[PDB]
Amino acid sequence: GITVLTHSELSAEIGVTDSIVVSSELVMPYTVGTWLRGVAANWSKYSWLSVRYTYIPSTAGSIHMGFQYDMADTVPVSVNQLSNLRGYVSGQVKSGSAGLCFINGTRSDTSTAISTTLDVSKLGKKWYPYKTSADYATAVGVDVNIATPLVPARLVIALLDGSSSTAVAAGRIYCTYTIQMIEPTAS
Numbered sequence: 001g002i003t004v005l006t007h008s009e010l011s012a013e014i015g016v017t018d019s020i021v022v023s024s025e026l027v028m029p030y031t032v033g034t035w036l037r038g039v040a041a042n043w044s045k046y047s048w049l050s051v052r053y054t055y056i057p058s059t060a061g062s063i064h065m066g067f068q069y070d071m072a073d074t075v076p077v078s079v080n081q082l083s084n085l086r087g088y089v090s091g092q093v094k095s096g097s098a099g100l101c102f103i104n105g106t107r108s109d110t111s112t113a114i115s116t117t118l119d120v121s122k123l124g125k126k127w128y129p130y131k132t133s134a135d136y137a138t139a140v141g142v143d144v145n146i147a148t149p150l151v152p153a154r155l156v157i158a159l160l161d162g163s164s165s166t167a168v169a170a171g172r173i174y175c176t177y178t179i180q181m182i183e184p185t186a187s
Helices: 034-042 079-084 097-105 133-140
Strands: 003-016 021-026 043-057 062-068 086-092 115-117 154-160 168-184
Touching: 003 034, 003 043, 003 097, 003 154, 034 043, 034 168, 043 062, 043 097, 062 079, 062 115, 062 168, 079 086, 079 154, 086 115, 097 168
Parallel strands: none
Antiparallel strands: 003 168, 021 154, 043 115, 043 168, 062 086, 062 154
């Protein structure tokens, strides 16, 4: 049967350096958070009803985020390339407070927040399999466009402008989501 879950969770630790760092992460239940990782493994398939990442400061540097929908694409390498992507967002790596709004799930003057939402209304299909990191790498190894039907999207993140060549703790990214899960099964 259809089960609905809405919840927020720590999704990544952020560090800044002087040299830009593009890295990305798949938007599936396995990867967003270690709680939902565990919870959703008890259903075979899922469907995002709403997902958002949002940075929280805790200094010199810039943070950059946006989504790709075809696992077939090449992951940007410059702030520029990234600048094109859907759901593009950016701000100062020491700015962010106004965000907690969305994570604490309350209220409100957002303009100043570093946060972006999956399109959902523009995803591939409705029901994706619960898949794991390993699974994705694996699949990719055969045909890339095998993967886009395994994973709804990927968040790509850029981090430059640091004043240190050594990584400096800047803040973090929280996923807040509303997922539906069908088809029970043994963890």
